[PDB]
Coordinates of C-alpha atoms and ligand atoms in Angstrom, one line a residue:
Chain A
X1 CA 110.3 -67.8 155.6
X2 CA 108.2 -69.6 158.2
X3 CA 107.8 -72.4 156.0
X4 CA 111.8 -73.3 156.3
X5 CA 111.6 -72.9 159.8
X6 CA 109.0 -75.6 161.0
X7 CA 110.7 -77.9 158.3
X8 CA 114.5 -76.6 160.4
X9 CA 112.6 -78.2 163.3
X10 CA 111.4 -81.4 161.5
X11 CA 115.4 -81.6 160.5
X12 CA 116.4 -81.2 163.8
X13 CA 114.1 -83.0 165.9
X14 CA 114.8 -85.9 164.1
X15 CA 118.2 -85.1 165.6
X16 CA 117.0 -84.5 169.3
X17 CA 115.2 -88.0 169.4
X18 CA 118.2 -90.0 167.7
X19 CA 119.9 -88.4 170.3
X20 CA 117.9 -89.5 173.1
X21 CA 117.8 -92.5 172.2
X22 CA 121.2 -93.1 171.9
X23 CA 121.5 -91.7 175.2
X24 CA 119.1 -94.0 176.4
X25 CA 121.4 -96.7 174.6
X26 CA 124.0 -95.5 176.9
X27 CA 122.4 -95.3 180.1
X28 CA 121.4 -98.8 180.0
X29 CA 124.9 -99.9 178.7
X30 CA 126.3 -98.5 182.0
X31 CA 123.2 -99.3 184.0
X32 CA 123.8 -103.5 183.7
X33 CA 127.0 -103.9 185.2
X34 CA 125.4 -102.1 188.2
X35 CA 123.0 -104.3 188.0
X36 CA 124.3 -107.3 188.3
X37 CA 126.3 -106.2 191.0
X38 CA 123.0 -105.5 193.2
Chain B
X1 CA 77.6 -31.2 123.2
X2 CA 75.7 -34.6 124.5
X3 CA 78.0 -36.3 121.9
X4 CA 80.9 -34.8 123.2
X5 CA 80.2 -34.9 127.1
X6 CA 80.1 -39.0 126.3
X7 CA 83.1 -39.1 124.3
X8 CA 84.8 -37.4 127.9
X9 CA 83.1 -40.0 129.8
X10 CA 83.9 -43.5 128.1
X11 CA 87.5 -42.5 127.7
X12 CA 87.4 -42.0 131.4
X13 CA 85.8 -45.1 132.0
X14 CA 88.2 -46.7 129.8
X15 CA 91.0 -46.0 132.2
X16 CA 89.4 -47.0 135.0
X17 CA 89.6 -50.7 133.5
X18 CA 93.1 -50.5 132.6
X19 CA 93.8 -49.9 135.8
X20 CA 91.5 -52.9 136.9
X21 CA 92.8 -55.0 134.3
X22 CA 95.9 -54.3 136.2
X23 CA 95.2 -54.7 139.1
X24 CA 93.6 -58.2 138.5
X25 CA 97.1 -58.7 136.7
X26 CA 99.0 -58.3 139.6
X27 CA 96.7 -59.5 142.3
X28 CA 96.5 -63.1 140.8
X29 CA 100.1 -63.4 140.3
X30 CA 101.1 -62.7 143.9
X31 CA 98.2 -64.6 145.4
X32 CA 99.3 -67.9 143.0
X33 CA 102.7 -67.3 143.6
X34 CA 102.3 -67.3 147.5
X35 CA 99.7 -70.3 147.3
X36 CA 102.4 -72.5 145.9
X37 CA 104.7 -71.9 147.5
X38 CA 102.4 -72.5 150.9
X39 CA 101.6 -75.7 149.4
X40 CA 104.6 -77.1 148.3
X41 CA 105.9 -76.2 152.0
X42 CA 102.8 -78.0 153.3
X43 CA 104.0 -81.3 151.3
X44 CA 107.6 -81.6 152.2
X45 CA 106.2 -81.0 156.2
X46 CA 104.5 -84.3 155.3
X47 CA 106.8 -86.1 152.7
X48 CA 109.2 -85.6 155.7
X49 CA 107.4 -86.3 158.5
X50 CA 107.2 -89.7 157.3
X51 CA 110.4 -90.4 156.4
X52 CA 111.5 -89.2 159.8
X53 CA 109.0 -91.6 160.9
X54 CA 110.7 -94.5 159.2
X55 CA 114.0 -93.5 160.2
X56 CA 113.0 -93.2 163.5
X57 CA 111.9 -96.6 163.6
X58 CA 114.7 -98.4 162.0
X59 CA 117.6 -96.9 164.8
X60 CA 115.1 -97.6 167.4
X61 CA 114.6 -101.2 166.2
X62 CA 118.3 -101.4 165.1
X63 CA 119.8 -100.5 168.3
X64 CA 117.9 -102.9 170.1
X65 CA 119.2 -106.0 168.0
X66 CA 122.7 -104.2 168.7
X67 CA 122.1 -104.6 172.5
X68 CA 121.1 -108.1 172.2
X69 CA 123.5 -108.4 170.1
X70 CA 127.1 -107.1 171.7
X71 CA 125.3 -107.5 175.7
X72 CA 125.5 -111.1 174.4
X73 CA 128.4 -111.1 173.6
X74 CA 129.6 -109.5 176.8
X75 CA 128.1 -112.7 178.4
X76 CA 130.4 -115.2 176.3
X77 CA 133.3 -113.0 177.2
Chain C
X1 CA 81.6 -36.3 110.2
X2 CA 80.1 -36.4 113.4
X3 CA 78.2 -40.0 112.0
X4 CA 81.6 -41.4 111.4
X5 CA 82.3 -39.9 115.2
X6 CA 79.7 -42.3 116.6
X7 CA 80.7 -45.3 114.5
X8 CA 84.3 -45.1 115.6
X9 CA 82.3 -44.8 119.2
X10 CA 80.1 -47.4 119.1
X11 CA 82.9 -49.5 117.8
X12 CA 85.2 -48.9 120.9
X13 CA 82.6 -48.8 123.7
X14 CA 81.8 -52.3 122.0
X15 CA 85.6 -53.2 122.7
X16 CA 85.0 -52.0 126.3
X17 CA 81.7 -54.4 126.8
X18 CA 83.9 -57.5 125.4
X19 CA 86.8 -56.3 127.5
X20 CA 85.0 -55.6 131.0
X21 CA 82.7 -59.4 130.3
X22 CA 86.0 -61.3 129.7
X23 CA 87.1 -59.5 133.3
X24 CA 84.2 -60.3 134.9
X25 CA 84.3 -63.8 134.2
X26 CA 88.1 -63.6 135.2
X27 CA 86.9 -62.5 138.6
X28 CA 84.1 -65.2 139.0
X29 CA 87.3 -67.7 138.0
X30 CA 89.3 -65.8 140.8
X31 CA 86.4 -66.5 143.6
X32 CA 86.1 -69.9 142.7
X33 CA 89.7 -70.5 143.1
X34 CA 89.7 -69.0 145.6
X35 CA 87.1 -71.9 147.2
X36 CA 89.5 -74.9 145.8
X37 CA 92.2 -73.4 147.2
X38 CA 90.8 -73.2 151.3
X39 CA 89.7 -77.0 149.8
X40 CA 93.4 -78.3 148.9
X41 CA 94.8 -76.4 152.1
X42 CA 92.5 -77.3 154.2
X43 CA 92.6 -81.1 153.7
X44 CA 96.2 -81.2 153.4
X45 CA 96.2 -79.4 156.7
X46 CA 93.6 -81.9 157.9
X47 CA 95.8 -84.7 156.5
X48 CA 99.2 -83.2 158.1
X49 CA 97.5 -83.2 161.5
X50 CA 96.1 -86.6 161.3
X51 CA 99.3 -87.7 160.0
X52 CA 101.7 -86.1 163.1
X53 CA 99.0 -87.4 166.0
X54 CA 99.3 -90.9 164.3
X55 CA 103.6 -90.6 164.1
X56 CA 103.4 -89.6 167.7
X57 CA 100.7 -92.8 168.1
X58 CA 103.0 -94.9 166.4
X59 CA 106.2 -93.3 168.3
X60 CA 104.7 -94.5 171.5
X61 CA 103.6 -97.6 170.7
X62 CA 107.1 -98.6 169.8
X63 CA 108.2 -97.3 172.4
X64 CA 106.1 -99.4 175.1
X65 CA 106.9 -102.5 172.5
X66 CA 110.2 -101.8 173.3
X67 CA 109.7 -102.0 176.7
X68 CA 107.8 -104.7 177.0
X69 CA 110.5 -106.5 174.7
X70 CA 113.7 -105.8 176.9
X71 CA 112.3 -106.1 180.2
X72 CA 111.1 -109.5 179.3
X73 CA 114.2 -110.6 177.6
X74 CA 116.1 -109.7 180.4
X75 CA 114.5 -111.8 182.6
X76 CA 114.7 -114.6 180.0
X77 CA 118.5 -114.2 179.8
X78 CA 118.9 -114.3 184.0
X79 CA 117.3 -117.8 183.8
X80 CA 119.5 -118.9 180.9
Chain D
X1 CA 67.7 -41.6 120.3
X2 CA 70.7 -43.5 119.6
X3 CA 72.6 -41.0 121.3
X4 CA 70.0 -41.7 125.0
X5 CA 70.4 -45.4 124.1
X6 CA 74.6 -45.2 124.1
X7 CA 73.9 -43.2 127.3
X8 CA 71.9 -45.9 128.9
X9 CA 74.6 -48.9 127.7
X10 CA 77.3 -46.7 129.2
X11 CA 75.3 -46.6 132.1
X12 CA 75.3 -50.0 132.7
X13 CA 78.5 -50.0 132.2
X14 CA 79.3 -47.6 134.0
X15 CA 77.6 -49.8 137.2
X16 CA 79.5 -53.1 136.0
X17 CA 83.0 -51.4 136.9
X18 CA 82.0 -50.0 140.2
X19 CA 81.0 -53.9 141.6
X20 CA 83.9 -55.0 139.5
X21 CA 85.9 -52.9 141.7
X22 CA 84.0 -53.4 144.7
X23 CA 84.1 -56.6 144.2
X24 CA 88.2 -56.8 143.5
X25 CA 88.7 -54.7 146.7
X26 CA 86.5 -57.6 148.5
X27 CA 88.9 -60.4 147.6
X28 CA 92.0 -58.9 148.2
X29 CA 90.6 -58.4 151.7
X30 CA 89.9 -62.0 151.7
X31 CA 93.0 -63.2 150.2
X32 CA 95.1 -61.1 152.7
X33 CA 92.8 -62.8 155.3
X34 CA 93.6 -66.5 154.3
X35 CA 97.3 -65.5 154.1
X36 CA 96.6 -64.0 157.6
X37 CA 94.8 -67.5 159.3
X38 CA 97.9 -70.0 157.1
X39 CA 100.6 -67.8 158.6
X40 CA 98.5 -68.9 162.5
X41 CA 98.5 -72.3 161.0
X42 CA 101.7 -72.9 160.7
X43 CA 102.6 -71.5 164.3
X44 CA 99.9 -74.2 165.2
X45 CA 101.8 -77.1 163.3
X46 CA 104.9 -76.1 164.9
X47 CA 104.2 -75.4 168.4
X48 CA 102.2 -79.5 168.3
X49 CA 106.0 -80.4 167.1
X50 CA 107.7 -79.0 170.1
X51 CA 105.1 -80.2 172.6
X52 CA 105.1 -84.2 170.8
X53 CA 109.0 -84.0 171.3
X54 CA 109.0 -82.8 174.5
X55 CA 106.4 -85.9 175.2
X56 CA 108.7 -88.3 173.4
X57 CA 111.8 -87.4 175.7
X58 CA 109.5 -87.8 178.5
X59 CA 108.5 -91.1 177.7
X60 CA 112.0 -92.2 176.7
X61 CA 112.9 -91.1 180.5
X62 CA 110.4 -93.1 182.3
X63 CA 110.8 -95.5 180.2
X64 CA 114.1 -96.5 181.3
X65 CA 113.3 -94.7 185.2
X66 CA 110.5 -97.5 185.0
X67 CA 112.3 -101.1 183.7
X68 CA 115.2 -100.1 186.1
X69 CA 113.4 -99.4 188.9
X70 CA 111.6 -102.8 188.4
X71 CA 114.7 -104.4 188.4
X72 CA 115.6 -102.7 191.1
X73 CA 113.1 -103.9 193.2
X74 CA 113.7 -107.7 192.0
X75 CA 117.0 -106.9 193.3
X76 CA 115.6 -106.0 196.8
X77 CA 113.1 -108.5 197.5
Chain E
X1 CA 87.9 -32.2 112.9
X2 CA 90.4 -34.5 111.2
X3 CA 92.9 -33.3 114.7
X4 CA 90.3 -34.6 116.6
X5 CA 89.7 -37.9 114.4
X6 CA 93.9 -38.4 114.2
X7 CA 93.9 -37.7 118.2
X8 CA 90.8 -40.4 118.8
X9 CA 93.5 -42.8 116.7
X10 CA 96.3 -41.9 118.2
X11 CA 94.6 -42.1 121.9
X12 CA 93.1 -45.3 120.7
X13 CA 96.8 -47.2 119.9
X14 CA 97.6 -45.7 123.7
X15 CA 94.9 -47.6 125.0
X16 CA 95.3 -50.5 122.7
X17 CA 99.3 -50.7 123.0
X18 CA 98.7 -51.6 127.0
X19 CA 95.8 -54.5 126.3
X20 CA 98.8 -56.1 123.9
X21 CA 101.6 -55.3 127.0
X22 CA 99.3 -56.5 129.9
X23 CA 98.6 -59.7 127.6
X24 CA 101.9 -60.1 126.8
X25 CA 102.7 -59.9 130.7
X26 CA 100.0 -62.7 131.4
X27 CA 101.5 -65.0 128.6
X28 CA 105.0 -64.5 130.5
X29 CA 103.0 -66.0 134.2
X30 CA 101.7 -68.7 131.9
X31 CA 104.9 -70.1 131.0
X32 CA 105.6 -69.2 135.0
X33 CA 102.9 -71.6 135.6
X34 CA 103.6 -74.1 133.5
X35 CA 107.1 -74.9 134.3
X36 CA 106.7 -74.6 137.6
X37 CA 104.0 -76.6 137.8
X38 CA 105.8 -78.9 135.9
X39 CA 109.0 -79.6 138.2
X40 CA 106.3 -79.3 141.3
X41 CA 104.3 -82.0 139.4
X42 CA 107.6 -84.2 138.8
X43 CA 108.4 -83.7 142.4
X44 CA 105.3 -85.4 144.0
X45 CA 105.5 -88.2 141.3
X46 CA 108.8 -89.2 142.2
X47 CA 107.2 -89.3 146.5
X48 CA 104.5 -91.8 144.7
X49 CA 106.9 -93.7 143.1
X50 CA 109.3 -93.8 146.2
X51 CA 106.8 -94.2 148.7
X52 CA 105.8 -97.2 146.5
X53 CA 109.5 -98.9 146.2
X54 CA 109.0 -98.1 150.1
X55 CA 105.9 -99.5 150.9
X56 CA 107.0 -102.9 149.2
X57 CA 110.2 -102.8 151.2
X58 CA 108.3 -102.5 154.1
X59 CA 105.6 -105.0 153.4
X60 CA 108.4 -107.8 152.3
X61 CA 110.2 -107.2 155.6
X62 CA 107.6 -107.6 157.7
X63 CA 106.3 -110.7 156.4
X64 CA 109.7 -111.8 156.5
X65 CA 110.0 -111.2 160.0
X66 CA 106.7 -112.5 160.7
X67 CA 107.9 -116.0 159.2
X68 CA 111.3 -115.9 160.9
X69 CA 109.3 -115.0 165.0
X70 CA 106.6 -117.9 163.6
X71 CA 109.1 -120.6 162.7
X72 CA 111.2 -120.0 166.3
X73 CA 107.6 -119.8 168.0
X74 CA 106.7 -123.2 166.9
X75 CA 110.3 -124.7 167.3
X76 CA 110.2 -123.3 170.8
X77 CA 106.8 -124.7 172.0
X78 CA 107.3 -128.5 170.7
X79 CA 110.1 -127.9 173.1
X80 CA 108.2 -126.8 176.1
Chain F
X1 CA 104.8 -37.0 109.9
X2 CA 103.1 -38.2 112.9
X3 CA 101.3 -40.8 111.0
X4 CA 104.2 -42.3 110.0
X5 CA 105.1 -42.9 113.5
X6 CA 101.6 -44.4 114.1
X7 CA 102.0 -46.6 111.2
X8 CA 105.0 -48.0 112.0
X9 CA 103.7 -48.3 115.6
X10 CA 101.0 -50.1 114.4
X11 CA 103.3 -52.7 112.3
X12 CA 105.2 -52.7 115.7
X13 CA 102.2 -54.3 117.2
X14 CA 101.1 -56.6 114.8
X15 CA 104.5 -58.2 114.9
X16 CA 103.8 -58.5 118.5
X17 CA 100.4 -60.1 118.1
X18 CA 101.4 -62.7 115.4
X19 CA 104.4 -63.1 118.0
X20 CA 101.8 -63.6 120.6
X21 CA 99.4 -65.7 119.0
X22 CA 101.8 -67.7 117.4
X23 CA 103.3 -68.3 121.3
X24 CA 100.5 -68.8 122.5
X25 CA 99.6 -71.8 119.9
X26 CA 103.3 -73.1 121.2
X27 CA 101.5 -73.1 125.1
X28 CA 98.4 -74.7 124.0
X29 CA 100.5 -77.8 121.9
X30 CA 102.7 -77.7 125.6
X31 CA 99.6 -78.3 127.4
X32 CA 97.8 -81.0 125.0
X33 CA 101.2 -83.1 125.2
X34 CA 101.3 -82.4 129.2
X35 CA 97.4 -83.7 129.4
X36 CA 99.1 -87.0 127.2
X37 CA 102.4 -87.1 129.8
X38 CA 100.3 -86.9 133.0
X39 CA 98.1 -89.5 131.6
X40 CA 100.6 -91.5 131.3
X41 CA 102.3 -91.3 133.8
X42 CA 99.2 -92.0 135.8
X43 CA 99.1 -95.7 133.8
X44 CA 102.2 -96.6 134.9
X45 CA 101.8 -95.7 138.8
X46 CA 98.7 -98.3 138.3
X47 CA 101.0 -101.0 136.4
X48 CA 103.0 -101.0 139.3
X49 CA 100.6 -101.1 142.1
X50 CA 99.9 -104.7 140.1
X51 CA 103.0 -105.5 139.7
X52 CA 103.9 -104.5 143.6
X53 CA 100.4 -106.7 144.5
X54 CA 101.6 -109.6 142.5
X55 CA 105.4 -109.0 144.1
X56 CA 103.6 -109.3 147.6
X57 CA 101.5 -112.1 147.0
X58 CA 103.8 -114.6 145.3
X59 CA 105.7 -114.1 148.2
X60 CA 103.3 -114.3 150.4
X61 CA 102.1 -118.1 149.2
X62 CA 106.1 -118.7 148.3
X63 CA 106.4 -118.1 152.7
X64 CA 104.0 -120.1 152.9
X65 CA 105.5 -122.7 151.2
X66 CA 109.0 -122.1 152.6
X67 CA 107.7 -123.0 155.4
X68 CA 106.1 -125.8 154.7
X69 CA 109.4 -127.0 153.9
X70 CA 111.3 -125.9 156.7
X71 CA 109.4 -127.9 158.5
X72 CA 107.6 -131.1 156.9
X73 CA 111.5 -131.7 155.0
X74 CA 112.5 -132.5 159.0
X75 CA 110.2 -134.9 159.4
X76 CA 110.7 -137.0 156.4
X77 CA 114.7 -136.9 157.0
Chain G
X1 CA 93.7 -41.6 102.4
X2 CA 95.4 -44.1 104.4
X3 CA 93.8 -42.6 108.0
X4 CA 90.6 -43.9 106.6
X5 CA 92.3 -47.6 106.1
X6 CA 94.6 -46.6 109.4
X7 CA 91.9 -46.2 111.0
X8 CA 90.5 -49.7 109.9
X9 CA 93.5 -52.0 110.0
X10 CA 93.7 -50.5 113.9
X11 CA 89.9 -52.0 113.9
X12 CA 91.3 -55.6 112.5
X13 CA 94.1 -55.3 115.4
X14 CA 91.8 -54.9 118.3
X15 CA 89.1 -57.6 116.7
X16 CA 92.1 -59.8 116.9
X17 CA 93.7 -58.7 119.9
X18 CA 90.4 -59.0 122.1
X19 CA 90.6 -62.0 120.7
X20 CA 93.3 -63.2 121.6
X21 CA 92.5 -62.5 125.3
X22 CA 89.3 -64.9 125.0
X23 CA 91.3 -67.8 124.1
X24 CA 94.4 -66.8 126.2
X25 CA 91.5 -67.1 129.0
X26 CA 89.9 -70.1 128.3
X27 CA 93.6 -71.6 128.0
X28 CA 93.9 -70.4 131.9
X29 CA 90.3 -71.8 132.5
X30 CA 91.2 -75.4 130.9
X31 CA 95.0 -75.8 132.5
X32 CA 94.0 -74.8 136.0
X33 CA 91.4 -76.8 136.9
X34 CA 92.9 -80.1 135.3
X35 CA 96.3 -79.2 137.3
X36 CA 94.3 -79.0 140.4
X37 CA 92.6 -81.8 139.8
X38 CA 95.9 -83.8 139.1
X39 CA 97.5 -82.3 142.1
X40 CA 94.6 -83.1 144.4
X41 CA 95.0 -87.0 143.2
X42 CA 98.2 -87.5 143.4
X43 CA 97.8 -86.2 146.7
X44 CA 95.1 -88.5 147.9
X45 CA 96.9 -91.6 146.3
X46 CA 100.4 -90.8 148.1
X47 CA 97.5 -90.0 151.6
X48 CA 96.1 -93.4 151.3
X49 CA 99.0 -95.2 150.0
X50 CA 100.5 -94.5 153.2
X51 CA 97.5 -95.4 155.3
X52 CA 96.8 -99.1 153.6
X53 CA 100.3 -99.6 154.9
X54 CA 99.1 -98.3 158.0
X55 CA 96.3 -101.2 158.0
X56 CA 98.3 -103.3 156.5
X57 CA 101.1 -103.6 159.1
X58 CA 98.4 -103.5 161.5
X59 CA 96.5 -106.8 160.5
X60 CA 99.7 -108.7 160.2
X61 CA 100.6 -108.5 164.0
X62 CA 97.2 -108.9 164.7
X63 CA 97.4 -112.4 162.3
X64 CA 100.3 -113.2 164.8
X65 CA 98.5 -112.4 168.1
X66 CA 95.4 -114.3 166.8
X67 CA 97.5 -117.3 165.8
X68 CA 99.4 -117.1 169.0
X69 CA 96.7 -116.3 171.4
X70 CA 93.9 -119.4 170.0
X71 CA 96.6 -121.5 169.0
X72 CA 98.2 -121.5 172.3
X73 CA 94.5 -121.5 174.2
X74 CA 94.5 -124.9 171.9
X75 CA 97.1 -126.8 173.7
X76 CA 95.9 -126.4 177.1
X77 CA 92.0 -127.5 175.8
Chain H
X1 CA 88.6 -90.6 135.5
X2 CA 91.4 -92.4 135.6
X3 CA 91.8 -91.1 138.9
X4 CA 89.0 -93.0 140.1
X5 CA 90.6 -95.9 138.4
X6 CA 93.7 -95.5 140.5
X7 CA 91.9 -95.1 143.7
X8 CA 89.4 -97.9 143.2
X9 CA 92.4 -100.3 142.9
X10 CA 93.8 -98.9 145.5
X11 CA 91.2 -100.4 147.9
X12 CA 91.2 -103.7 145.8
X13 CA 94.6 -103.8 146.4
X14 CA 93.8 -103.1 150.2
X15 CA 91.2 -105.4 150.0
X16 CA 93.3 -108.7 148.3
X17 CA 96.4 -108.4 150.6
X18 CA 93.9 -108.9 153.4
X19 CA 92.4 -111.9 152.1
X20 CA 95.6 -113.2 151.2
X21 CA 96.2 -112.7 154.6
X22 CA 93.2 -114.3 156.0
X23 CA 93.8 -116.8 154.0
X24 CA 97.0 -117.8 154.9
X25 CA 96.0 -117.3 158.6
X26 CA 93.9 -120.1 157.7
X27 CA 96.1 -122.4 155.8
X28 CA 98.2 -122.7 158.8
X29 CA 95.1 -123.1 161.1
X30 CA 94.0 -126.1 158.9
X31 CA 98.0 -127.4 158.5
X32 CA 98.6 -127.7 162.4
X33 CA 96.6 -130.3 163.2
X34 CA 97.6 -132.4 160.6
X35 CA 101.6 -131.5 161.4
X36 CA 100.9 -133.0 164.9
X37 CA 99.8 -136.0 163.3
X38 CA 103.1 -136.5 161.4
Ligands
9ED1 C1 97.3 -85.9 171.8 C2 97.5 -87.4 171.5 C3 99.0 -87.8 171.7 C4 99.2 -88.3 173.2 C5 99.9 -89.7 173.2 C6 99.4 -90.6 174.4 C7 98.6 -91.8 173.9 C8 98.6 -93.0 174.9 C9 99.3 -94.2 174.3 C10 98.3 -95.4 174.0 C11 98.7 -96.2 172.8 C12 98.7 -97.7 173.0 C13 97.8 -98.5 172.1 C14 98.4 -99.9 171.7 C15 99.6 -99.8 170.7 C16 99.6 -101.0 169.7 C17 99.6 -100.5 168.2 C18 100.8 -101.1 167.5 O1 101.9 -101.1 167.9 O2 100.6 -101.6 166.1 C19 101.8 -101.6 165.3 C20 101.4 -100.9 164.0 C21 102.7 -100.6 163.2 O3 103.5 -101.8 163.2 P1 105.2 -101.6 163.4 O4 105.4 -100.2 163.9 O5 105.7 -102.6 164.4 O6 106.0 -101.7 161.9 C22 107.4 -101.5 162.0 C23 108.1 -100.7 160.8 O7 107.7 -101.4 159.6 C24 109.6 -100.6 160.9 O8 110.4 -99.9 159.9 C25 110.0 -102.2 160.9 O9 111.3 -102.3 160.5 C26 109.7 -102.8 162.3 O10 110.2 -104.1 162.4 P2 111.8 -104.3 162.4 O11 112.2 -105.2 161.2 O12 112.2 -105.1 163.6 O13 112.5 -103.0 162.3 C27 108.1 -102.8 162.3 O14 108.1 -102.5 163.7 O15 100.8 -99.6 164.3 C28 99.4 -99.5 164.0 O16 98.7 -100.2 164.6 C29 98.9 -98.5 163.0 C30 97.4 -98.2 163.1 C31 96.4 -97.6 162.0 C32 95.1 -96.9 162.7 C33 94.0 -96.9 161.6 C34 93.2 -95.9 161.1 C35 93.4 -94.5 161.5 C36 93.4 -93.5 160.3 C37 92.3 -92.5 160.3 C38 92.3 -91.5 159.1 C39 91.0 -91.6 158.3 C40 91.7 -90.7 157.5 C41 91.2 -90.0 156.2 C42 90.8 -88.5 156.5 C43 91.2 -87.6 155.3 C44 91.5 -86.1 155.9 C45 90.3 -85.4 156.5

């Protein structure tokens, strides 16, 4: 059943780094307005 | 007697190959069955991989244009 | 009686040859499959590897792309 | 004669089971041994995964730790 | 001796009644094989055939980008 | 009486046989006409690499020529 | 009577059913390595399908750097 | 062998798209000078 398993982890890694890089997204979003500010 | 003492020996050898037969059945059968099924496994880890690949380029890409995009229009507005 | 009792004999040990050669030859089949199949695994293992270091290549080099596009276009916006 | 002749056919049959078996004992060893060394290469595959996300979040961080703080410093000087 | 010629008969349908059931068993793998093998072989036609609609995607988009960045590049540098 | 049980035994085979050697003729026309699918299926995959080269290229030259007109048609008007 | 003729249709059987395991054989020596065969292919094409667009992509950005980099070393010669 | 007959155009297929390439890499080389003049 290992075989599901590393493929569980492509399925959700794909996740993880969508994820960050929405984050990433986000953190710049609410990092300008501080910039300009500065 | 000689005759005899044979006839007791190939039917005992004749069973022993059965039971080889057999076991050549059943050993190819589960070693196919579990090299398929590796294999297949090994090709969706790599028919995958690459569409996560693509994927992962396109929202990368995409939500660039959408910060150039609406932090653009932030200017106008 | 005991003629026809070697016939009958001769007949199924001859069975048994033609039996045990088409084994043999079954199990000369089975050891060379056995060599295609760490042939297959192994370069689709090889390719699987090669294919994951060059996502992560490819991964990164967006990445710094990236980079290199924003902070630039930044820059280019402040002066216009 | 016939009857020392059968005996010496049987004979060498006789031998050709033994390898035979010999021989099947020898590759299920060696089949349970490949199953053995593709169940540690999948572990392999998946632990590389884990470590290349782990380096992608990494990068993502300094990434944007990095164009910030060069803005940043614009900001100071 | 006829008991012992019906019992080498009757012993030899035993051994010959198996050989037919152990065949029949193999013939049942083969179409095991064979149908598996089929869906497994429809399955990586359609990632050729997919990969190929992809690939061309990819190729067309890229050269489309590369004439939309070249046509602002010039534009921009008569400009400056 | 016991050789009436071998005998219909025996029948009781034979139907099996012709059952398997008439099934396994069906499995060897399965496999001829599989050789005749993969085969061409295999022609087809190579059609439309041509036809996916062709696709590209046209394109390429027709860009080309797109731009030619986006930007020689300026001059003139 | 019939033991006699018992004994030889039994014979006919086993002439045929030991035939029958030849040919069942070869059938499994023919369709395995031509699936393997057709496997491995299919396999390499998909492998360097993806790489050309690999080498592909990377040439075309190289076109653009090499048509940016001289071009633009052109205007200040 | 008509696997090698896939694989083999294949790499002309490889092999075309980057002359194609080249070659356009050249029109434009040879059609700047002469869009300066116009
Ligand atoms: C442990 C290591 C990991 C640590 C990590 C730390 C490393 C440090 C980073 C330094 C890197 C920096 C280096 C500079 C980076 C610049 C590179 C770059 O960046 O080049 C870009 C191209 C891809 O180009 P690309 O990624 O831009 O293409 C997209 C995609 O098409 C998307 O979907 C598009 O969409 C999008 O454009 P969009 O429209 O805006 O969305 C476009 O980006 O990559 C390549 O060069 C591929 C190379 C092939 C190599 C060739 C051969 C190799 C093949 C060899 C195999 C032979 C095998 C058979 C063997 C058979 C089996 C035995």
């Amino acid at each position: 059943s290992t075989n599901q398993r590393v493929l569980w982890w492509s399925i959700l890694q794909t996740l993880i780094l969508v994820a960050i890089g929405v984050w990433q997204m986000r953190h710049l979003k609410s990092f300008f307005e501080a910039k300009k500010l500065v």
